Structure 1
Amino acid sequence: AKPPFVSRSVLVTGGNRGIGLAIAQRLAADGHKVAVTHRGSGAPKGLFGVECDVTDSDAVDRAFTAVEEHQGPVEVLVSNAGLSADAFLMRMTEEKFEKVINANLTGAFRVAQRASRSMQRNKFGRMIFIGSVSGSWGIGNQANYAASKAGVIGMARSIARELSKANVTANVVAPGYIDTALQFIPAKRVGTPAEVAGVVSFLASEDASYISGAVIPVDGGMGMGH
């Protein structure tokens, strides 16, 4: 039987634009209480926004605090993701590598860490990490991006191993080419932000309870491999 809906306290990081925005809007339409973080550009009409730079652990702490006061402790964390600085390995700098790692990977650790306490205590948690945006498949021109997104999957699986006994799961959505190279895609087209948002809606629902440590590709078949 289909489990009854529960309106969850949702935080979507980088939920003001692109895929993050479509996630945020879908989760709100689903009936959840949705908050987003942003860099300054503001949150969309309707939804609760807080400014947060995910490279700053204290700014992550006060974004969560603000969210808990507004709508209750975060039950569903959607970690978008992120940045985007490419380059040939030979031309790629230490600075470019570390900034993408700090935003995309360590940033994911920061928001996950800040959520884990309350999720554990309350015996409910859904951590959903959004790859940007083509992976496991070695692309670029982007040693930094590939490293951060593969690292998020390893991180998620470690969290999943640790916290699944407490009904706190961690899963990854791996988008391919999304419209916010067609030769490599069996669907022969790019996906939409809504097509990503629907997989996140599923992972944020009562139907996803026995999924944990999973990586769900949303790429029209592009990254089939090993």
Structure 2
Amino acid sequence: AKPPFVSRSVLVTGGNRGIGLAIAQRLAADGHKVAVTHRGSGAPKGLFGVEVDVTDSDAVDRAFTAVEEHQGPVEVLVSNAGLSADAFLMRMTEEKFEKVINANLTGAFRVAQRASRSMQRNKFGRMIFIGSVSGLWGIGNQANYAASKAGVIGMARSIARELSKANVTANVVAPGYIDTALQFIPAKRVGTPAEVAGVVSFLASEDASYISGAVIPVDGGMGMGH
């Protein structure tokens, strides 16, 4: 019994390339009103773009405001914005660790916090964080990345336990290797950006209403374990 479609105001952070762009274009094809953040490179044709560095809480504030004026308060937030700085643990610096934590984990916090008020008050919110298989699988040479992506799971679950009663859910999509090593992947191939985008499409839809606190692996089976 399929629920009627609702055009949601969407913000995809880092929505101008790779996986974020694929998500942005898919959600736009689904019928949503899609805004993206970026910083310098520019937004894709058709979609509303706003400049944000997610390490800047004030810049995150006036991005949401700019989006609210353009297409209504963010109802679906897709936190994709991140980066890596891999190294052997012994080789890894305080600076390299903190820069990845600040962008990937604290940056996710900044957008989630900014999103929360309007979602709580309108009794609707979908926070969808793009994590990684690395979070709970443990890829070597990414103590910073893995900490950030596991941390977003913890963050999302705390939010889910607090805000699900207000119809504000928080879920993580955990992509494996995505073409934007093969021995570890049962499917014996990398995934496509469209394969990540299709899962986000599902999480942003009326069909995902009773899913909250979930980590959905999109990794051809790579991340299976405990």
SS of the residue aligned with 2:199? helix
Partners of 2:133 and 2:19 in 1: CA distance: 10
| 2:55 alignment partner in structure 1 | 55
Structure 2: tracts of 5 or more residues without a match: none
Residue-by-residue CA offset, 1:57-81 (whole Å, 9 max, x unaligned): 0000000000000000000000003
Q: Contact between 1:135 and 1:176, CA under 8 Å: does it hold in 2? A: no
SS of the residue aligned with 2:78? strand
Q: Contact between 1:120 and 1:163, CA under 8 Å: does it hold in 2? A: yes
Structure 1: tracts of 5 or more residues without a match: none
Q: Contact between 1:68 and 1:74, CA under 8 Å: does it hold in 2? A: yes
Residue-by-residue CA offset, 1:103-140 (whole Å, 9 max, x unaligned): 00000000000000000000000000001464310002
Residue-by-residue CA offset, 1:184-207 (whole Å, 9 max, x unaligned): 000000000000000000000000
Q: Contact between 2:136 and 2:150, CA under 8 Å: does it hold in 1? A: yes
Q: How far did 1:27 drift?
A: 0.0
| Within-5 A mapping of 1:35-184 | 35-132=35-132, 134-184=134-184
- Which runs of 4 or more aligned residues in structure 1 lie more than 2 Å from their structure 2 counterparts after TM superposition? 132-135
Q: TM-score, normalised by structure 2?
A: 0.99
Q: How large is the Cα RMSD of the aligned pairs?
A: 0.7
Q: Contact between 2:18 and 2:193, CA under 8 Å: does it hold in 1? A: yes
Q: TM-score, normalised by structure 1?
A: 0.99
Residue-by-residue CA offset, 1:126-158 (whole Å, 9 max, x unaligned): 000001464310002000000000000000000
Matched positions, count: 226
Residue-by-residue CA offset, 1:7-47 (whole Å, 9 max, x unaligned): 00000000000000000000000000000000110000000
Q: How far did 1:84 drift?
A: 1.0
Percent of matched pairs sharing the same residue: 99
Q: Contact between 1:82 and 1:132, CA under 8 Å: does it hold in 2? A: no
Partners of 2:118 and 2:169 in 1: CA distance: 13
SS of the residue aligned with 2:45? coil
Instruction: Say if 1:134 and 1:179 are closer, same or farther in 2 by CA, change over 3 A.
Output: farther
Partners of 2:139 and 2:100 in 1: CA distance: 15
